[PDB]
């Protein structure tokens, strides 16, 4: 304490390894002058000695966003320690940490004192009473390194701590960085199963189940977790949708509503029809988003010229036509989403067909034919003019049906009526045109069943068109009224082909004879997009159950969030079942992740002999077929050696090697981590070199140095070897049984010169003194690496940390070289006491260790104290017993 320095007792340690900190959120509370607010915060700089860089963002409701880009507060000191710890180090393997002592003194080189403290998590050159400190001389404005060897005997976040203080100067700073000592292992993610789900196609039953086996992972290192994840992926398809017509050379459809009722409709019929179509096909863009309002005014334009012939129910002079009044409900009950229509001029010409032009069987009559007789289309054939006339007015009043279900009493009876006369006479039709006109006059009610269903599917010649001999504009209208059902019906295996014929006629509409040939070749092609399934499907709803689930499990892969990956996972190993349901296809993949030569293509052989100056020799070979590229030779000496300044320039001149002129500087004193750059390591043979090292620093217990070999392109595939003059490869001498390790770096613990009642009471009341028992050795086992003794406690003179009752057996452990210490025979009593640092294992399964501080004495038997030579010991042991049980230690 009274030295010109700073003991380990005040050098607070730099444990701010972490990069992220000061992630705070603060507002501009203070009152502002000129829209500028001042905030003062008193922060406590993290322990890392580098240069923290900032970065901040201001969100002002008024002043949107700003980037107050961060500056720089450099953090430095006169002397610190850069404890360079890896992201992790395996348990049971010996490594080599780096700890740079940067001295940025002007021209004052620092006489340092660097000391590695003990940690019962790391079997190092520093034990509980011994310190492993050294004394270096870092030139001014320089970086000096210091190797420290260890053996992580325990997993989990461990602890490392170097504190250094200069002599004569009063500087001091440690760095407590912690490393994740992980159990050796291999990152693996075996696939558990890769199958497909679909209760429609798989199982052939609903609720398709899928049983799932737990991951075997036969090779999982003990004490290590492992997770499993699950994937939920909808894999929908889209198909069976055909293209509407380009409407592209269909620029003749919008001629202005003009004329008497019938001429006011030959030329407004293509108008509304272009509108309803390019609405449900999205063709509006390439046609003219703008000519649409030059067309929604030649629809409601005829709506008030057509409202200029509506007698009390063509000419107003002339008798009302049952054909121009049942087509006044077909051009209106579709132009209701387009213009203002009266549920009095629509619901006042449909109560006139049921009440004025309807016979007792639902058949519709024609009193005053329409003057323009080509527009009627395909009824013009007087052939069956009450099967093509009873099917046409039958679709002009099943269309106006929702608008005004309350304005007409007369509907519910006329609808069934007409449809009872037709279904009877449906087996009595010839024209492919009256089979399709009645066909769709019916299929809006659900009665095309039985014989009326199969006679309507065959009437399609080639089965994609309903055609009759003669006129063609009565085949297209037959093919349309034919597709009308096909879709009103919800069948689409006979719709695919029927729609490949209609746009194969490149029927752009209009013409003379086509006021019906235009209204149908479109509304049919116009309704085909609102039905199109688009093959959109997937209402999967699967259920999960797992040995950890106390709660129920449910997700659902609907079409809108179907490609949304719905995944679930755990940390534990289970078996379980899945239960899929509903339409749609998907795929299921599951995967667990758990924990299943250091040389990898680089041989290394490091040798040490005497010439107290010694000579080193290193061997490296590349396990490649190609002579490896520029490799490197990292070297950190043993404590007390600097290279002979005459063999660092005999290998710096040889080609194929190099020693940066930065390694000639500093000379003999400051040079304890070398860098010999190699230009090639042949694959053929080992390429071997060697130099000389004198003994400039004298010390007890020197440090196993090292030699590291790696290519420059991968710091990863390297091969490090150690070398000590005493142990064989650099590895300190330790006793291992299985997983457990200890620091057997000691001497052979062991003429009854003196032992009195007072000599025991003092050594049995010392600090470390924890346990004192009178045990009897029961069993004696002996291994090739160490021995042990199963002794039973006959009395607890002094209970320690170990809660043990009289009678139980506590296992004792000792090195194999201590077999001559005390020949612990069987069925003999012994008085023993040790320290708490001798405990081995974990409660309640602990184990005692016969160490240097473990007092072992032979306790005479009952009939042995009678001997006139063992009495002196029997009285001392007996008195020592009573002087402990009731009395205690004199301190």
């Amino acid at each position: 304490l009274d030295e010109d320095i700073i003991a380990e007792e005040n050098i607070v340690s730099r444990s701010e390894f972490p990069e992220s900190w000061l992630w705070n959120v603060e507002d501009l509370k203070e009152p502002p002058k000129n829209g500028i607010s001042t905030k003062l915060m008193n922060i406590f700089l993290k322990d890392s000695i580098t240069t923290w860089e900032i970065l901040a963002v201001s969100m002002s409701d008024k002043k949107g966003i700003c980037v107050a880009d961060p500056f720089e507060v450099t953090v430095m000191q006169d002397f610190f320690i850069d404890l360079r710890l890896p992201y992790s180090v395996v348990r049971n393997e010996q490594v080599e940490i780096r700890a740079v002592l940067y001295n940025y003194r002007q021209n004052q080189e620092l006489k340092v004192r660097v000391e590695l403290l003990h940690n019962p998590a790391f079997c190092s050159l520093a034990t509980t009473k011994r310190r492993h400190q050294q004394t270096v001389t870092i030139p001014p404005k320089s970086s000096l390194s210091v190797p420290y060897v260890i053996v992580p005997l325990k997993t989990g976040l461990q602890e490392v701590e170097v504190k250094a203080a200069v002599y004569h100067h009063f500087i001091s700073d440690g760095v407590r960085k912690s490393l994740k000592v992980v159990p050796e292992g291999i990152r693996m993610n075996k696939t558990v199963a890769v199958r497909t789900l679909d209760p429609e196609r798989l199982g052939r039953e609903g609720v398709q189940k899928e049983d799932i086996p737990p991951a075997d992972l036969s090779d999982q290192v003990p004490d290590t977790e492992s997770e499993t994840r699950i994937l939920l992926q909808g894999t929908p398809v889209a198909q069976m949708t055909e293209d509407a017509v380009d409407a592209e050379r269909l620029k003749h459809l919008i001629v202005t509503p003009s004329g008497c009722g019938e001429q006011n409709m030959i030329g407004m019929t293509p108008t509304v029809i272009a509108v309803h179509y390019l609405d449900e096909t999205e063709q509006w863009e390439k046609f003219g988003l703008e000519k649409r309002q030059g067309a929604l005014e030649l629809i409601k334009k005829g709506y008030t010229q057509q409202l200029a012939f509506r007698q009390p129910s063509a000419f107003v002079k002339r008798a009302p036509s049952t054909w121009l009044t049942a087509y006044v409900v077909k051009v209106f009950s579709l132009a209701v989403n387009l213009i203002a229509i009266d549920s009095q001029v629509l619901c006042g010409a449909v109560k006139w067909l049921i009440l004025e032009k309807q016979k007792p069987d639902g058949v519709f009559q024609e009193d005053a034919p329409v003057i323009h007789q080509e527009m009627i289309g395909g009824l013009r054939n007087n052939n069956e003019k009450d099967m093509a006339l009873t099917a046409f007015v039958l679709i002009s009043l099943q269309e106006a049906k929702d608008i005004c279900e309350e304005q007409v009493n007369s509907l519910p009876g006329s609808i069934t009526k007409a449809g009872d006369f037709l279904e009877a006479n449906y087996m009595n039709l010839q024209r492919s045109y009256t089979v399709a006109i009645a066909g769709y006059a019916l299929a809006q009610m659900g009665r095309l069943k039985g014989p009326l269903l199969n006679k309507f599917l065959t009437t399609a010649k080639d089965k994609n068109r309903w055609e009759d001999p003669g006129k063609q504009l009565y085949n297209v209208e037959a093919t349309s009224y034919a597709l009308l059902a096909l879709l009103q019906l919800k069948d689409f295996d006979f719709v695919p082909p029927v729609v490949r014929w209609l746009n194969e006629q490149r029927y752009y509409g209009g013409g003379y004879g086509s006021t019906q040939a235009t209204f149908m070749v479109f509304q049919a092609l116009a309704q085909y997009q609102k039905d199109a399934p688009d093959h959109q499907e997937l209402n999967l709803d699967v259920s999960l159950q797992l040995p950890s689930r106390s709660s129920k499990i449910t997700h659902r892969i609907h079409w809108e969030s179907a490609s949304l990956l719905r995944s679930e996972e755990t940390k534990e190993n289970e078996g379980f079942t899945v239960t899929a349901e509903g339409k749609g296809q998907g795929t299921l993949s599951v995967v667990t992740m758990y924990h299943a030569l250091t040389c990898n293509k680089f041989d290394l052989k490091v040798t040490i002999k005497p010439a107290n100056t010694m000579i080193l020799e290193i061997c490296t070979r590349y396990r490649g077929d190609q002579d490896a590229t520029m490799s490197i030779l990292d070297i950190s000496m043993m404590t007390g050696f600097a290279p002979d300044t005459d063999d660092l320039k005999q290998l710096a001149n040889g080609v194929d090697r190099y020693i940066s002129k930065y390694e000639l500087d500093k000379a003999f004193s400051d040079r304890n981590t070398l860098i010999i750059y190699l230009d090639k390591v042949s694959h053929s043979e080992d390429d071997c070199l060697a130099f000389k090292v004198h003994q400039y620093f004298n010390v007890e217990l020197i440090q196993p140095g090292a030699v590291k070999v790696y290519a420059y392109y991968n710091l990863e595939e390297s091969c490090t070897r150690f070398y000590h003059p005493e142990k064989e490869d650099g590895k300190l001498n330790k006793l291992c049984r299985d997983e457990l390790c200890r620091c057997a770096e000691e001497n052979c613990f062991i003429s009854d010169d003196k032992v009195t009642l007072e000599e025991r009471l003092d050594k049995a009341c010392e600090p470390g003194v924890d346990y004192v028992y009178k045990t009897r050795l029961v069993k004696v086992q002996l291994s090739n690496d160490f021995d042990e003794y199963i002794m039973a406690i006959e009395q607890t003179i002094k209970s320690g940390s170990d809660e043990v009752q009289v009678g139980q057996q506590r296992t004792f452990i000792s090195p194999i070289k201590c077999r001559e210490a005390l020949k612990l025979e069987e069925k003999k009593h012994y008085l023993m006491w040790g320290l708490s640092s001798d405990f081995w294992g974990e409660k309640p399964n602990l184990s005692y260790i016969i160490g240097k501080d473990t007092w072992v004495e032979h306790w005479p038997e009952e009939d042995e104290c009678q001997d006139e030579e063992n009495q002196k010991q029997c009285q001392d042991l007996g008195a020592f017993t009573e002087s402990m049980v009731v009395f205690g230690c004199p301190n």
Binding site: L40, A56, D61, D82, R292, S567, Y662
Partner: protein, 634 residues
């Protein structure tokens, strides 16, 4: 001849505020207007809220702002009724309800540590908003591992976050993503690399003398290697550098160039000869390709290693390139054409202090800006004759053989009537800063029987995609020129256009429309203000743990977020970070104006700035259904 015209933005937006310009020229007295929006096609009634009346006081100028509450684009039917004379039309709608933003507290994460992202909602205007949002987190393989669904309501635009990286999880390039729930197709991408690392204590800069490599420079591309500790001081060590040939995305590693020198004092020197260059592969072929370096500094203490890398060094004999992309692509016959060449060094960065001259007019010259764009002009003869431009760089030190050149073309501006009615807008293009006054010059072009009729020009100001401000300017008969003083605020930043025009009826019963647009980049700055400095008035390097007050200056009522970061994390990875400059760099990429420079005809100038014109006598602009601008046709 009262006629009714009307304008708006080119591509509208959602849950945002777009404006629009009523009008009634030659109108008499008042006129009650009622505006409306019906979805398309049909009638749904989406925003009919607006009303107004064009006084003879606001010069027959009325004004209104609104809030509009597959795989194919949907459109909006918009309607305006001027007393009785109604006019309507359709305009394309964009699903984008704004922008969304990310910042990862670290640039690289060790599996086990936490990630602290933070996202910031805003609209097409840079203000705070409260909507709703979805935030996933994908691994380097493309699989959502965790997601959330909070809302930034009464949060002030800013959002908190934290996701833990599991001990076992794939390494490589993770990717976090987000998007307004309203628009699920517009999603944003920000990344953080997960890898097992230890922070280095120094940094390494790789700096060749030349930006680019001259093919016939025997000496070769030299390179300075400067290592320096995080805290400033000078790093001593030895390094490993290696070169190579990139060809698009492919990289030709050169094992015949791999060097090693003494990084002394934080400055080492490595060169590569032109012969270790030819035998890793002729040489009129390697032209176009770029190269790349790979340093690796390991100290003389053997504790730390850092890996630095430069990429994209061009082998151009012609150092400077010549871009014509800040340049207009149309002109007005009989008037000056401003030229905003864009010179770049070979890597991509702009040139400096490099004169450039016209193909003819040897006397004509330009001087480099700190930005790689100079100031040139030339008179155009009264020809509708396309203008073929062959710019030549004229910096001494080189030959008329090492001088790069580039030829673009400007096209005539078609006037209605073509009678011969132009408008030319001349502007003092200066590096305008917030708080300056920029003149606005109006050069009319018409016979003198119809210049006693032009009593007001009308105009507008674009800005990130929205409309900023509007009104009128006054011109008296006999003034073919009136200036317009305009003051700069923080908002036009970054770039802003400007359109102007008049209306008159001339020739033979012909209402006429001539106009002219224009684009200027104003200094890129955060609009309000914010700085972080060291509170103490005297700075000494604080030792680890000490108290230092930290001062800060921003806008009042503003919320503020703050985070520190070790400069030892930005020495393995310093990408995927956030730049305000990466901020504006994105609010420009999302503009609706595309050929800022010019216009083909009075309607083209509108779609070529981000606007749709329409009126009550037939004239109107191009129907823009194209979200993404005209995919640049080179």
């Amino acid at each position: 001849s009262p006629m009714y015209s009307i304008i708006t933005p080119n591509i509208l937006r959602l849950e945002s505020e777009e404006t629009m310009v009523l009008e009634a020229h030659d109108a008499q007295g008042d006129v009650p207007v009622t505006v409306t929006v019906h979805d398309f096609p049909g009638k749904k009634l989406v925003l009919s809220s607006e009303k107004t009346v064009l006084t003879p006081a606001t010069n027959h100028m009325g004004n209104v702002t609104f809030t509009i509450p597959k795989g194919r684009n949907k459109f909006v039917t918009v309607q305006a009724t001027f007393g009785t004379q109604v006019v309507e039309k359709v305009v394309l709608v964009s699903l984008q309800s704004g922008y969304l933003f990310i910042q990862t507290d670290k640039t690289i994460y060790t599996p086990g540590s936490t990630v602290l992202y933070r996202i910031f909602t805003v609209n097409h205007k840079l203000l705070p908003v409260g909507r709703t949002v979805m935030v996933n987190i994908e691994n380097p393989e493309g699989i959502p591992v965790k997601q959330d669904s909070l809302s930034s309501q009464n949060q002030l635009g800013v959002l908190p976050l934290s996701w833990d990286i599991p001990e076992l999880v794939n390494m490589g390039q993770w990717k976090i993503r987000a998007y307004y729930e309203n628009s699920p197709q517009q999603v944003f991408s920000t990344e953080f690399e997960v890898k097992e690392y230890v922070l280095p204590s120094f940094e390494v800069i790789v700096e060749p003398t030349e930006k680019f490599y001259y093919i016939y420079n025997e000496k070769g591309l030299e390179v300075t290697i400067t290592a320096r500790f995080l805290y400033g001081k000078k790093v001593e060590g030895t390094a490993f550098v290696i070169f190579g040939i990139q060809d698009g995305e492919q990289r030709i590693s050169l094992p015949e160039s791999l060097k090693r020198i003494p990084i002394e004092d934080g400055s080492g020197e490595v060169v590569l000869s032109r012969k270790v260059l030819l035998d890793g592969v002729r040489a009129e072929d390697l032209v176009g390709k770029s190269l790349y370096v790979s340093a690796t500094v390991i100290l003389h203490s053997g504790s730390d290693m850092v890996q630095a890398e430069r990429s994209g060094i061009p082998i151009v004999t012609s150092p400077y390139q010549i871009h014509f992309t800040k340049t207009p692509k149309y002109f007005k016959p009989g008037m000056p054409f401003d030229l905003m060449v864009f010179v770049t060094n070979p890597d991509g960065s702009p040139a400096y202090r490099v004169p450039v001259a016209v193909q003819g007019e040897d006397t004509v010259q330009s001087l480099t800006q700190g930005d790689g764009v100079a100031k040139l002009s030339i008179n155009t003869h009264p020809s509708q004759k396309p203008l073929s431009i062959t710019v030549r760089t004229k910096k001494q030190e080189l030959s008329e053989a090492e001088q790069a050149t580039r030829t673009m073309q400007a096209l005539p501006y078609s006037t209605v009537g073509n009678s011969n009615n132009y408008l030319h807008l001349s502007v003092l293009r200066t590096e305008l800063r917030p708080g300056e006054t920029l003149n606005v010059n109006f050069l009319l072009r018409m016979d003198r029987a119809h210049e006693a009729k032009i009593r007001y020009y009308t105009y507008l100001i674009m800005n990130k995609g929205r409309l900023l401000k509007a009104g009128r300017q006054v011109r008296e008969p006999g003034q073919d020129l009136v200036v317009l003083p305009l003051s700069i605020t923080t908002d036009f930043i970054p770039s802003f256009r400007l359109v102007a025009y008049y209306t008159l009826i001339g020739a033979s019963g012909q209402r006429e429309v001539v106009a002219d647009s224009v684009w200027v980049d104003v200094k890129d700055s955060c609009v309000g203000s914010l700085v972080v400095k060291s509170g103490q008035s005297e700075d000494r390097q604080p030792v680890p743990g000490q108290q230092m007050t930290l001062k800060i200056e921003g806008d009042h009522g503003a919320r503020v977020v703050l985070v520190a970061v070790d400069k030892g994390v930005f020495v393995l990875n310093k990408k995927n970070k956030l730049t305000q400059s990466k901020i504006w760099d994105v609010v420009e990429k999302a503009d609706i104006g595309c050929t800022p420079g010019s216009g083909k005809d009075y309607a083209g100038v509108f779609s070529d700035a981000g606007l749709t014109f329409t009126s009550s006598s037939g004239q109107q602009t191009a129907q823009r259904a194209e979200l993404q601008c005209p995919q640049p046709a080179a």
